[PDB]
Design an enzyme around this catalytic site. Structure first.
Site, short mmCIF file in Angstrom:
data_model
loop_
_atom_site.label_atom_id
_atom_site.label_comp_id
_atom_site.label_asym_id
_atom_site.label_seq_id
_atom_site.Cartn_x
_atom_site.Cartn_y
_atom_site.Cartn_z
N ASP B 334 0.83 -1.20 0.00
CA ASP B 334 0.00 0.00 0.00
C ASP B 334 0.88 1.27 0.00
OD1 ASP B 334 -2.95 0.96 0.36
OD2 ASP B 334 -1.92 1.90 2.04
N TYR B 460 -1.65 11.16 2.90
CA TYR B 460 -2.54 11.49 1.77
C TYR B 460 -2.59 12.98 1.44
CZ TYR B 460 -4.97 6.96 2.23
OH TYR B 460 -5.29 5.64 2.24
N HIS B 518 -7.47 -6.30 -0.73
CA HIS B 518 -6.47 -5.27 -0.45
C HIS B 518 -5.47 -5.59 0.65
CE1 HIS B 518 -4.93 -1.44 1.16
NE2 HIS B 518 -4.53 -1.35 -0.12
O1 LIG Z 1 -4.61 8.06 -2.26
S1 LIG Z 1 -3.80 7.51 -3.26
O2 LIG Z 1 -2.92 8.25 -4.06
N1 LIG Z 1 -4.70 6.67 -4.42
C1 LIG Z 1 -4.28 5.47 -5.26
C2 LIG Z 1 -3.47 5.90 -6.44
C3 LIG Z 1 -4.40 5.44 -7.51
C4 LIG Z 1 -5.33 4.35 -7.06
C5 LIG Z 1 -5.45 4.56 -5.66
C6 LIG Z 1 -2.95 5.98 -2.67
C7 LIG Z 1 -1.52 5.71 -3.13
C8 LIG Z 1 -0.87 4.49 -2.65
N2 LIG Z 1 -1.43 3.56 -1.83
C9 LIG Z 1 -2.75 3.86 -1.42
N3 LIG Z 1 -3.58 3.24 -0.65
C10 LIG Z 1 -4.74 3.74 -0.44
C11 LIG Z 1 -5.79 3.34 0.39
C12 LIG Z 1 -5.49 2.52 1.52
C13 LIG Z 1 -6.46 2.11 2.46
C14 LIG Z 1 -7.86 2.60 2.24
C15 LIG Z 1 -8.88 2.18 3.23
F1 LIG Z 1 -8.38 2.23 4.46
F2 LIG Z 1 -9.77 3.06 3.30
F3 LIG Z 1 -9.70 1.15 3.00
C16 LIG Z 1 -8.23 3.48 1.10
C17 LIG Z 1 -7.18 3.78 0.28
N4 LIG Z 1 -4.78 4.75 -1.05
C18 LIG Z 1 -3.57 4.94 -1.73
#
Ligand SMILES: O=S(=O)(NC1CCCC1)c1ccnc2nc(-c3ccc(C(F)(F)F)cc3)[nH]c12
Ligand SMILES: O=S(=O)(NC1CCCC1)c1ccnc2nc(-c3ccc(C(F)(F)F)cc3)[nH]c12
Lengths: 541, 541
Positions: B334, B460, B518
Site C-alpha cells: 500500500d 494522503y 487489499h
Molecule cells: O490516495 S492515493 O494516491 N490513491 C491510489 C493511487 C491510484 C489508485 C489509488 C494511494 C496511493 C498508494 N497507496 C494507497 N492506498 C490507499 C488506500 C489505503 C487504504 C484505504 C482504506 F483504508 F480506506 F480502506 C483506502 C485507500 N490509497 C492509496
C-alpha cells in the site's frame, strides 16, 4: 574567522580519484591522450555526465551514453578501441580501488572536535550497479563523521554552478569568509574563492594539510594517534527483549553481518564497549552490546538467585531465541567474561566463538567450596545493603574512584572489610581519569540511578550456586574457537591466573595488552579493537 | 483426560532418525550386522554414549571414544574397517540429512491450539562440531512451538532412567494419566507407560498420528492446510531509533542474515506483517518490520509536511545509517509500496532490492497536478480533523469495517464525500472477518490509541509535494532487482494499473495472487510468503 570546513570526496576525502583513472586507462591502452577524458565531458552542461551528476539519470543509464561518446570521440583521431573495452569494467575497478584518505579524515575529525562545522560537497551519481554496496559502505563510513553531506544528484545542482555554492552556504548558515573549501579541481574551486571563501587546491595531502593547518591555526599534521570512534547514546538503535515476565534485556545494535554479543563487567554498561561498537560494525559485524541483568535499561530483580550463572546464561539463550539467532560470537569482560566461558561450556551450539577480556577460565574445585576462602572485596560484597549504601552514596565519586587507569591511584581490594569500606581511604573529590570525560562519567551516574547497585552486587552473591553448576562441566572441554585476552596491570584478574587454560582449551588463541589496567576497553581501545577484529576475521568468519 | 503431549525429537519430531544411520552405514560397508550399533552402546550406563547424553562430555570429545569402541567391537568378529572410516563424517552427514517431520509438528501445533501443553523430551548431546549451527537452527525452529524442551545433556539425566520421567512430570505439573508420550523406542517408552501415561510407539507417522487422533479425540490427520506462524508482540525484539529530534522509529526484529525492511500501508502496523516475519527469518533473512511514521510506537508529528515522501524516504535512509546498514531489501504494501518505489528511484545505493505488494509504480505527470482530479476517499482525506474524527470515533468499528476479505462486504471508496463519510452506510456492529481474530483487531485498537489517525491521514495530504519531487525522477530507470505483486480483488490498487511498469522497470519480476483483496498479507499469507521467499532467494541473495 573560520568555523566551517568543506571537503570534496574524490581526490580529497577518497583516493585514488576515480577521475584519475581516465588518464591511467588511455595510457595503459596506448590511446591518444585525453581521448577518454574528452569522451567523459562531451556536451559539457548539456552532456550525459552532467545529467548524471544532476540526478537526471542513474549510473547504469549513463554507462551506454559514455561508451557511445568514446566511439564518437575516437572518430576525431581515427583510432580503434579494444574488443573487451568496458566502461562498466573500468569504473567498477576504479570505484572498488578508491579508499578513504585517512590523514584527510583525521584532519576533518580534529576540526570538528575543535567546534568546526564540517561538510562534504561532492558531484556524484545515483549508483545502481550490482556492485553499488561497496560505495554505499564507504559513504556510510565517511559521513557519521560530518555535519552535512551534499550530493549533486540529490540536490539537482552540480559544480561549478554558483547555485550549489549558495546552497552549501545556506546549509552551513555561514558567511563565505568563515569557510574553508578543499577541492582537487581548480574550476570547482574558483566559484567558492570569488565568493570570498578560503580555498585549498588539493594535490597532495601533506601539502594540502599544511595549508589547512596554517589557515585554521590548528595542529593537523604529525598529531598523535587519535582514539577510535565512540558512541553517542542518542544516535544508537536500542533493542528490548522480554526473556521472561518481569525480566527485559536492553542492547545497542549496530552494523550488519555475523552477530557479536558484548557482555560487560562490574559495575558497567553497554557503554563500556563504546570504542568497540563502531570498529567491529565497520569490520563487517552485527554488534549487540548488552546491558547485563541488573544494569541500565535491563531489569534489575531484587532476588539474589536471579543472578546466578545458570539463570543468567539461560536468559542469554532465550534472548537469542527471541531475536531469531541460532548463534552469536560471545565477547565478555570481567563478569561478562565469566558468563561467556559458561555459555561455551553449557551451550556451544549457540556460541559461534567465545572471547574473554581479563577474565580467566578456571575449572571449579569439587573438593572445596569458594566460600571456604586478601581479595577481601568479595566478602565485603556478600552482605546485602552494605556495599549498596556505600556505592550508591555518591555516584560521581563511585565511578571516578573505580574508573582509573594503571598510572592513576587505582584503589586497593585488600583489607576493605577491615577498613569497613571500598572508599574509606579515598578522597571525597577524586580526580578525573584520562580514560573518561566528565560527560562519560555522568552517563554511568544516570544509568545507575534507575536500579542502583543491588542487582550488580547480586552477581557476587551466588558463589556456592555457580560452583555446583560449574562442577557439572568438570569433564568437558572448550573445543569451539576461543580467545583469551590478558591485561598486564589488572591486579584482580591477573594474567598469571589464565596460564593453565590450555589444559581445558587446547586450541586457545591469545592476546596480551601491556600497561593496561582492569578497565581494558577504555584503557587501550585501539589495541583491544586490533586484537578482537584480527581474531574475528580468522576464527569467527 | 489428557492435557499434555510429549514428543521425542529423533525418529518422532525429526527424520530420518540419526540412530537409523548406524544400520545404513554397516550394511553400506558390508559390515557385520549391529557391529556399529553395538560399538555405540558399549558399556551401557557407564558407557561413552551415556556420558555424552548426560552432559558429562561434549560431542567432539565423544567422537574419539566411539572410534575406539568401533575397533574394540571389531575384534569380536575379527573384521577390518575402511581406511577413510570417520565417525565425524558419519554423524555430520546424518545430522545434516535429518529434518523436521512436518506432519508431526503440525499435529503438535494443533494440540497446542486446542489448549494442550506440549513438550520435547530428547536424549541429546552438547554439540561443539564446526557444523553445530545446522542443528542449532533446527532446534530453534522446532521449539518456539513447544511449551518445554527437555534435553538430557542439560538436565543430567537420560532415558530410560525413571528420574527423567518424574522430572518431565514436575515440569508439566500433570498426573501421568493426563499425558501422551511419543517415542520411536520401546525401552524409552516403558518407564512412562508403567507410570500410567498414555504411550505411542512411533514407527510410521500416519499410523502414529492415527493413534494420537484416537487418544486425544482431535482431527490430526488430513486436516486442511494451516496458516503460517504469526507473531506474539510480547515475544518480539523491539527496536527504537531517533532519526531526528522528536522523531523516533520503532521496528520489530527477527532473524539473522541480509536485512529485509517491511513497510506497511494505511492504516496499519508492523503487525500487518505478522505471518511474514517468522517465515522470512526462517528463510535466512534479518527482518525489520517497521511502524511507519505516524503509527504505533513511532513518532506522530502533527505537521502535514512531515509526511511527504521526500521526508519519509530521508528518515528511512537515516534509520539505515544509524543501524549501521549500507543496504536493506525494501518491501512495501500500500503506502509502504509507494515509499519503497521512491527509495529505489532516489536511493538505489541503500536498496538491495525492492518489492511492492498491490502498489504499482506510476511515473508522475509533469503536465497535470494530481490535485486537478470517483476515488472520492482521497478528497475526503484532505480535510484535517474530518476523517480523523470519523475513524477515531469507534476504533473497533473502524478496523472490522476496513479489514475485510474479498467475499466479505468490503465497503465502497466512491461518493464517500457525497455520503459524508466512509462508514455512513456501515453497520454500528460490523461482523468479524475470517482474516482476523477479535484479539488481533484489539491490537490495532491499542496501537491507534496513542497517536490517532492524524499522522497516517497526513500521508494522503502531500499530493502536490510528492508530485514535484517525483518529476525529478522522470528521466530515471529502476535497474535494481524489483518485484511487483498484484492482488486480483484489490479495487483501489487494481492489477491493471501496474501493466506499463516494464517501460520503466525492464527487468521487473512479477507475482500475482488470486481471490485476494487489499489486505494482502493476512488475506493470503501462505501465497505471499511463497512469492517473497522465492524472489529473495533468486534476487536478493
Ligand atoms: O490516495 S492515493 O494516491 N490513491 C491510489 C493511487 C491510484 C489508485 C489509488 C494511494 C496511493 C498508494 N497507496 C494507497 N492506498 C490507499 C488506500 C489505503 C487504504 C484505504 C482504506 F483504508 F480506506 F480502506 C483506502 C485507500 N490509497 C492509496
Ligand atoms: O569476585 S570474584 O569471583 N573474584 C575473582 C576470581 C579470582 C580473582 C578475582 C570475580 C569473578 C569474575 N570477574 C570479577 N571481577 C571482579 C571485580 C570487578 C570490579 C571490581 C571493582 F569495581 F571494585 F573495582 C572488583 C572486582 N571481581 C570478579
Amino acid at each position: 574567522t573560520l568555523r566551517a570546513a568543506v571537503f570534496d570526496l574524490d581526490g580529497v576525502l577518497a583516493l585514488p580519484a576515480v577521475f584519475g583513472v581516465l588518464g591511467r586507462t588511455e595510457e595503459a591502452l596506448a590511446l591518444p591522450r585525453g581521448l577518454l577524458n574528452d569522451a567523459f565531458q562531451k556536451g559539457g552542461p548539456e552532456g550525459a555526465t552532467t545529467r548524471l551528476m544532476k540526478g537526471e539519470i542513474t549510473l547504469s543509464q549513463w554507462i551506454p551514453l559514455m561508451e557511445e561518446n568514446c566511439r564518437k570521440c575516437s572518430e576525431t583521431a581515427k583510432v580503434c578501441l579494444p574488443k573487451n573495452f568496458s566502461i562498466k569494467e573500468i569504473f567498477d575497478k576504479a570505484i572498488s580501488a578508491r579508499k578513504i584518505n585517512r590523514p584527510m579524515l583525521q584532519a576533518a575529525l580534529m576540526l570538528r572536535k575543535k567546534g568546526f562545522t564540517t561538510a562534504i560537497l561532492t558531484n556524484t551519481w545515483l549508483d545502481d550497479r550490482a556492485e553499488r554496496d561497496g560505495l554505499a559502505q564507504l559513504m556510510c563510513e565517511l559521513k557519521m563523521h560530518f555535519d552535512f553531506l551534499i550530493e549533486s544528484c540529490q540536490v539537482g545542482m552540480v559544480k561549478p554552478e554558483p547555485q550549489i555554492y549558495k546552497f552549501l552556504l545556506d546549509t552551513l548558515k555561514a558567511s563565505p569568509s568563515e569557510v574553508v573549501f578543499l577541492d582537487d579541481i581548480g574550476a570547482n574551486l574558483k566559484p567558492a574563492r570569488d565568493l570570498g571563501m578560503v580555498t585549498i587546491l588539493v594535490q597532495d595531502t601533506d601539502t594540502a594539510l599544511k595549508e589547512l593547518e596554517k589557515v585554521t591555526g590548528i595542529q593537523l599534521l604529525n598529531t598523535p594517534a587519535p582514539l577510535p570512534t565512540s558512541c553517542n547514546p542518542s544516535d544508537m538503535s536500542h533493542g528490548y527483549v522480554t526473556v521472561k515476565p518481569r525480566v527485559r534485556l536492553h542492547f545497542v545494535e549496530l552494523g550488519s553481518g555475523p552477530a557479536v554479543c558484548l557482555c560487560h563487567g562490574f559495575p558497567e554498561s553497554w557503554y563500556s564497549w563504546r570504542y568497540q561498537i563502531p570498529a567491529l560494525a565497520q569490520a563487517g559485524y552485527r554488534v549487540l552490546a548488552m546491558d547485563m541483568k541488573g544494569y541500565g535499561e535491563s531489569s534489575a530483580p531484587p532476588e539474589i538467585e536471579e543472578y546466578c550463572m545458570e539463570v543468567l546464561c539461560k536468559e542469554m539463550v532465550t534472548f537469542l531465541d527471541k531475536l531469531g539467532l541460532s548463534q552469536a560470537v560471545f565477547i565478555g569482560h570481567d563478569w561478562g567474561g565469566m558468563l561467556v566461558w559458561y555459555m561455551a561450556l553449557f551451550y556451544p551450539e549457540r556460541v559461534r566463538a567465545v572471547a574473554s577480556l581479563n577474565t580467566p577460565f578456571i575449572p571449579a574445585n569439587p573438593n572445596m567450596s569458594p566460600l571456604e576462602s586478601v581479595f577481601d572485596y568479595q566478602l565485603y560484597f556478600q552482605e546485602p545493603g552494605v556495599a549498596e549504601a556505600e556505592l550508591e552514596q555518591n555516584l560521581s565519586r563511585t565511578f571516578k574512584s573505580l574508573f582509573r587507569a594503571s598510572d592513576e591511584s587505582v584503589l586497593s581490594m585488600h583489607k576493605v572489610c577491615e577498613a569497613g569500606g571500598l572508599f574509606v581511604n579515598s578522597p571525597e573529590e577524586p580526580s578525573l581519569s584520562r580514560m573518561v570525560t566528565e560527560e562519560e562519567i555522568q552517563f554511568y551516574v544516570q544509568q545507575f540511578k534507575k536500579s542502583g547497585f543491588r542487582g550488580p552486587l547480586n552477581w557476587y552473591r551466588n558463589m556456592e550456586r555457580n560452583w555446583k553448576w560449574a562442577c557439572k562441566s568438570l569433564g568437558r572441554k572448550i573445543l569451539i574457537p576461543a580467545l583469551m585476552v590478558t591485561a598486564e596491570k589488572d591486579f584482580v584478574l591477573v594474567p598469571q591466573m589464565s596460564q593453565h587454560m590450555e589444559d581445558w582449551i587446547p586450541h586457545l588463541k591469545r592476546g596480551h595488552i601491556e600497561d593496561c589496567g582492569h578497565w581494558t576497553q577504555m584503557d587501550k581501545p585501539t589495541e583491544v579493537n586490533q586484537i578482537l577484529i584480527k581474531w574475528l576475521d580468522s576464527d569467527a568468519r
